[PDB]
């Protein structure tokens, strides 16, 4: 079978600036193992092809995973903007695949705060679709250059979510999987 359990029920998930991608190649895939599950917050397949999907064949499947706030999961989708879709994770407009996401307050909040999950807050430009930026070069907001020293106009580009179990559902951590379907000229392996 295709190792979709290794991505969906992993104990740890990546920060969104460092979003993880796992490749699914040469394997038989049980899609029913997901599309018969529960308390998933959202399971929209933007891939106008797959609306609920089915048992299709794909040259490869790719799973992209990360943790974002609750308010920001809107962005994990065609044509949106904001800190998450501009600076962290951006899908193309020609997207065929699904955006699976669930509330993980149970796993990713800590009494007094989990601060291990981060996002990029400053960036000189917007990401291209499926592009990743894990650099930590100080961001120059003004015109005086920074020279490795943080201060006015010289901001460390990443910020942490302050994930606490108390705050509203919109500020709570959610895990997100993004399945994308590759259709190349080659044996359909899934």
């Amino acid at each position, epitope marked *: 079978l295709c190792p979709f359990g290794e991505v969906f029920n992993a104990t740890r998930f990546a920060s969104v600036y460092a979003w993880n991608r796992k490749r699914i190649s040469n394997c038989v895939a049980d899609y029913s193992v997901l599309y018969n599950s529960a308390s998933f917050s959202t399971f929209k397949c933007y891939g106008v092809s797959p609306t609920k999907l089915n048992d299709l064949c794909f040259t490869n499947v790719y799973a992209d995973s990360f943790v974002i706030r609750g308010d920001e999961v809107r962005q994990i989708a065609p044509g949106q903007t904001g800190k998450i879709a501009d600076y962290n994770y951006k899908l193309p407009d020609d997207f065929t695949g699904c955006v699976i996401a669930w509330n993980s307050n149970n796993l990713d909040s800590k009494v007094g705060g989990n601060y291990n999950y981060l996002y990029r*807050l400053f960036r000189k430009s917007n990401l291209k679709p499926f592009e990743r930026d894990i650099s930590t070069e100080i961001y120059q*907001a003004g015109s005086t250059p920074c020279n490795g020293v*943080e*201060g*006015f106009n010289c901001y460390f580009p990443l910020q942490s979510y302050g994930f606490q179990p108390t705050n509203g559902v919109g500020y709570q951590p959610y895990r997100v999987v993004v399945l994308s379907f590759e259709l190349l000229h080659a044996p359909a392996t899934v």
Partner: nanobody
Amino acid sequence: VQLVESGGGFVQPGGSLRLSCLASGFAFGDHYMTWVRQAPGKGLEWVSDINNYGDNTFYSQSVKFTVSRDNAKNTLYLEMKSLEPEDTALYYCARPRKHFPGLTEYDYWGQGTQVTV
């Protein structure tokens, strides 16, 4: 064309303080204003913003703290209560250049006032 913080000193855990920032040289009404924090050898930490008139105030995860503005007296205030020791840093008054609250490009700021709880 400047900004001078004032207030602060040494106070005890659970004490208080009211910092002031006398602006000068510009139309204090036409701008948002900011408080940021800098512990020694660290980056800027954003504390609060306030809008032109004073009815929208945005704070960080430190409500312990209230921002006020008297655009007649060109003064920006920050009343700090229920201080912790972790609230110790140098406290800056700063004006953004051109509302998503938090750190942005600041075109003017002051010299700082030390708060050590």
